[PDB]
């Protein structure tokens, strides 16, 4: 991927991170298993997009996120939800850093 398409993918990823955080919050508030499932699916889609960047730290945090996701239809426990939000903030940090680094790269 050229740095420009990397930047486009990074913008998409950063937006979906906030979307997934919002869906996790809504699923915890409504206490519904279907909302949990929806949020986990959104997370899986985000992971599938994130893996295409072939960035090592991004892949590492994606693996952490996959570890923080519940199995299939199972809801996430409280500590698991907190761990999920933690890994999501970490992914947001590295995605923002990579966006900054790519924007620096395009400038010359």
């Amino acid at each position: 991927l050229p740095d420009e398409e990397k930047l486009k993918l990074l913008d998409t990823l950063l937006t979906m991170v906030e979307w997934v955080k919002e869906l996790l919050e809504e699923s915890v508030e409504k206490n519904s298993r279907m909302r949990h499932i929806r949020a986990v699916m959104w997370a899986e889609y985000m992971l599938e997009i994130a893996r295409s960047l072939e960035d090592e730290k991004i892949l590492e945090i994606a693996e952490k996120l996959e570890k923080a996701l519940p199995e299939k239809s199972k809801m996430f426990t409280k500590e698991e939800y907190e761990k999920l939000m933690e890994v999501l903030e970490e992914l947001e940090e590295v995605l923002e850093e990579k966006k900054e680094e790519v924007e620096e790269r395009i400038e010359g």
Partner: protein
């Protein structure tokens, strides 16, 4: 390039209201699934025929709603007027309908297995 947009991307009050009502109906149906699982335990215990037929009736009602919702959601995911948020929303709705339908079908099988 591809419409990445910002982070507030519903874009339509009609579709948003429809999706919200659909999500509430899905919550109700999943809760009914849990209740019917408890009642299926009761039916394994008792083998009451009336309870069998009643559970089957509620399962059928839920399954019919879910089949209609599934068809609608797949059509809506086959729209070309779609953005990223809407596309993922429709795909997730379809997938969750698949899951709930399969759970309902398995419970229907388990409940049909009893002699009654």
């Amino acid at each position: 390039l591809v419409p990445r947009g910002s982070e507030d991307k519903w874009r339509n009050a009609f579709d948003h209201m429809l999706m919200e009502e659909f999500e509430e109906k899905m919550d109700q149906i999943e809760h009914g699934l849990l209740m019917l699982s408890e009642q299926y335990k009761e039916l394994e215990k008792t083998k009451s025929k009336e309870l069998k037929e009643q559970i089957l009736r509620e399962l059928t009602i839920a399954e019919n709603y879910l089949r209609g919702a599934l068809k609608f959601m797949q059509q809506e995911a086959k729209r070309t007027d779609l953005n990223m948020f809407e596309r993922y929303n429709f795909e997730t709705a379809v997938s969750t309908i698949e899951i709930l339908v399969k759970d309902l079908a398995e419970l229907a099988k388990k409940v049909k297995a009893v002699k009654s």
